[PDB]
Design an enzyme around this catalytic site. Structure first.
Site, PDB file in Angstrom:
ATOM      1  N   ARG A  75      -0.258   8.981   0.868  1.00 16.06           N
ATOM      2  CA  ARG A  75      -1.048   8.981   2.094  1.00 16.06           C
ATOM      3  C   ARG A  75      -0.449   8.144   3.224  1.00 16.06           C
ATOM      4  NH1 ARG A  75      -3.525   6.320  -1.687  1.00 16.06           N
ATOM      5  NH2 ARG A  75      -3.736   3.994  -1.356  1.00 16.06           N
ATOM      6  N   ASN A  76       0.436   7.180   2.885  1.00 17.25           N
ATOM      7  CA  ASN A  76       1.071   6.284   3.845  1.00 17.25           C
ATOM      8  C   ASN A  76       2.539   6.611   4.060  1.00 17.25           C
ATOM      9  OD1 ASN A  76      -1.252   4.844   4.335  1.00 17.25           O
ATOM     10  ND2 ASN A  76      -0.923   3.612   2.455  1.00 17.25           N
ATOM     11  N   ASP A 115       2.523   2.682   7.962  1.00 15.73           N
ATOM     12  CA  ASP A 115       1.398   1.801   7.616  1.00 15.73           C
ATOM     13  C   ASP A 115       1.789   0.331   7.410  1.00 15.73           C
ATOM     14  OD1 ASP A 115      -1.134   0.945   7.283  1.00 15.73           O
ATOM     15  OD2 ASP A 115      -1.401   1.818   5.261  1.00 15.73           O
ATOM     16  N   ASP A 154       0.849  -1.184   0.000  1.00 22.44           N
ATOM     17  CA  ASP A 154       0.000   0.000   0.000  1.00 22.44           C
ATOM     18  C   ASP A 154       0.893   1.245   0.000  1.00 22.44           C
ATOM     19  OD1 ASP A 154      -2.386   1.417  -0.062  1.00 22.44           O
ATOM     20  OD2 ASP A 154      -2.814   1.146   2.049  1.00 22.44           O
TER      21      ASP A 154
HETATM   22  C1  LIG Z   1       1.629   5.676  16.634  1.00 22.63           C
HETATM   23  C2  LIG Z   1       1.753   4.764  15.566  1.00 22.63           C
HETATM   24  C3  LIG Z   1       1.379   3.421  15.775  1.00 22.63           C
HETATM   25  C4  LIG Z   1       1.517   2.543  14.681  1.00 22.63           C
HETATM   26  C5  LIG Z   1       2.055   2.995  13.473  1.00 22.63           C
HETATM   27  C6  LIG Z   1       2.432   4.336  13.291  1.00 22.63           C
HETATM   28 CL1  LIG Z   1       3.059   4.837  11.745  1.00 22.63          CL
HETATM   29  C7  LIG Z   1       2.258   5.222  14.348  1.00 22.63           C
HETATM   30  N1  LIG Z   1       2.635   6.570  14.239  1.00 22.63           N
HETATM   31  C8  LIG Z   1       1.857   7.460  13.563  1.00 22.63           C
HETATM   32  O1  LIG Z   1       0.805   7.092  13.031  1.00 22.63           O
HETATM   33  C9  LIG Z   1       2.226   8.786  13.412  1.00 22.63           C
HETATM   34  C10 LIG Z   1       3.416   9.426  13.607  1.00 22.63           C
HETATM   35  N2  LIG Z   1       3.462  10.765  13.364  1.00 22.63           N
HETATM   36  C11 LIG Z   1       2.272  11.280  12.990  1.00 22.63           C
HETATM   37  N3  LIG Z   1       2.098  12.568  12.653  1.00 22.63           N
HETATM   38  C12 LIG Z   1       0.937  13.081  12.142  1.00 22.63           C
HETATM   39  C13 LIG Z   1       0.807  14.478  12.336  1.00 22.63           C
HETATM   40  C14 LIG Z   1      -0.343  15.127  11.866  1.00 22.63           C
HETATM   41  N4  LIG Z   1      -0.506  16.485  12.008  1.00 22.63           N
HETATM   42  C15 LIG Z   1       0.642  17.356  12.014  1.00 22.63           C
HETATM   43  C16 LIG Z   1       0.349  18.740  12.616  1.00 22.63           C
HETATM   44  O2  LIG Z   1      -0.803  19.266  11.922  1.00 22.63           O
HETATM   45  C17 LIG Z   1      -1.931  18.496  12.425  1.00 22.63           C
HETATM   46  C18 LIG Z   1      -1.849  17.075  11.846  1.00 22.63           C
HETATM   47  C19 LIG Z   1      -1.302  14.383  11.205  1.00 22.63           C
HETATM   48  C20 LIG Z   1      -1.172  13.018  10.978  1.00 22.63           C
HETATM   49  N5  LIG Z   1      -2.122  12.290  10.341  1.00 22.63           N
HETATM   50  C21 LIG Z   1      -3.526  12.569  10.604  1.00 22.63           C
HETATM   51  C22 LIG Z   1      -4.444  11.942   9.611  1.00 22.63           C
HETATM   52  O3  LIG Z   1      -4.054  10.577   9.378  1.00 22.63           O
HETATM   53  C23 LIG Z   1      -2.751  10.493   8.744  1.00 22.63           C
HETATM   54  C24 LIG Z   1      -1.683  11.074   9.662  1.00 22.63           C
HETATM   55  C25 LIG Z   1      -0.046  12.377  11.453  1.00 22.63           C
HETATM   56  S1  LIG Z   1       1.141   9.983  12.910  1.00 22.63           S
END
Ligand SMILES: Cc1cccc(Cl)c1NC(=O)c1cnc(Nc2cc(N3CCOCC3)cc(N3CCOCC3)c2)s1
Length: 285
Positions: A134-135, A148, A130
């Site tokens: 977006r990922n 992802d 994938d």
């Molecule tokens: C925590 C976790 C568990 C399993 C796998 C993963 Cl890859 C993760 N870590 C994460 O998902 C993330 C690490 N850094 C992140 N920063 C982030 C930061 C932000 N923002 C950045 C500041 O502006 C607000 C939104 C949004 C997102 N999104 C929201 C919508 O869905 C897609 C990602 C994500 S998300």
């Protein structure tokens, strides 16, 4: 995996939400910013296996362009996975919100980082299935990291992945994966070519408004995405070779990283642009 006590974790802001958990920005005991994904009570066995399985996969990787795992909370509820925090979010949204704000060299550097992450995954015998902007996540150094991870959860949870006449994100997926379920690192190379087009266009939707069936028919008839505006010829030359119908003819990720690194190291090479086919004619006397 490192087990983190819940008293070290402070959830500050919901940044992503789902039916069965949310993703938060927070702080991990000075304390450091982290992202936190939860799994709410009542989860099924399959949900637990999928959730912790993501953390298990990420814990096996140590690369600059792969999201780093800080640890898990599994002994208390809700369970949590804690990772580095990427301050600029998902790459597709980021580029759409920053249209035209980067140099060609910065854009190509993003792609080299994604390619180096994908080279690591492929050499680790991990097929992503994938790969799409977006990922990919983006930090405050503009570094792009692949995100992802999992098994069946990856395509199941992606809203862009649709049931076909397998559940897959058709516009990103190689023909053999659509046709007969063959997902390999070479199908990830096709995906990467789509991600190159997404980056160079600042997050345009691949194939614009063509339907999924229309995309499959166009690809099978030999059509391919046209050059982005302002795209280096070498970049277009590379994304086209990622889209070869014959899987064996696609570059490997090692070839992709090598080419991108050579272009960046001789940045004048990026000044030669592919011709852009205009869709609009403007005539002035
Ligand atoms: C925590 C976790 C568990 C399993 C796998 C993963 Cl890859 C993760 N870590 C994460 O998902 C993330 C690490 N850094 C992140 N920063 C982030 C930061 C932000 N923002 C950045 C500041 O502006 C607000 C939104 C949004 C997102 N999104 C929201 C919508 O869905 C897609 C990602 C994500 S998300």
């Amino acid at each position: 995996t490192t087990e983190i006590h819940p008293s070290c974790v402070t959830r500050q802001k919901v940044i992503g939400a789902g039916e069965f958990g949310e993703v938060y920005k927070g702080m991990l005991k000075k304390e450091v910013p982290v992202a936190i994904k939860t799994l709410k009570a009542g989860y099924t066995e399959k949900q637990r296996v999928d959730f912790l399985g993501e953390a298990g996969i990420m814990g096996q990787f140590s690369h600059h362009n792969i999201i780093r795992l800080e640890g898990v909370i599994s002994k208390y509820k809700p369970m949590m996975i804690i990772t580095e925090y990427m301050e600029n979010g998902a790459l597709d949204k980021f580029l759409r919100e920053k249209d035209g704000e980067f140099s060609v060299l910065q854009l190509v550097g993003m792609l080299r980082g994604i390619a180096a992450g994908m080279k690591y995954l492929a050499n680790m015998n991990y097929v992503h299935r994938d790969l799409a902007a977006r990922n990919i996540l983006v930090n405050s150094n503009l570094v792009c990291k692949v995100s992802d991870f999992g098994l069946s959860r990856v395509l199941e949870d992606d809203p862009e992945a649709t049931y076909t006449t397998g559940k897959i994100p058709i516009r990103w997926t190689a023909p053999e994966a659509i046709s007969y379920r063959k997902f390999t690192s070479a199908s990830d190379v096709w995906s990467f070519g789509i991600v190159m087009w997404e980056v160079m266009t600042y997050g345009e939707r691949p194939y614009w408004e063509l339907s999924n069936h229309e995309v499959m028919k166009a690809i099978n008839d030999g059509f391919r995405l046209p050059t982005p505006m302002d795209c280096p010829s070498a970049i277009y030359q590379l994304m086209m070779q990622c889209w070869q119908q014959e899987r064996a003819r696609r570059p490997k990720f090692a070839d992709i990283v090598s080419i991108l690194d050579k272009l960046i190291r001789a940045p004048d090479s990026l000044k030669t642009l592919a011709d852009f086919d205009p869709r609009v004619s403007i005539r002035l006397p």
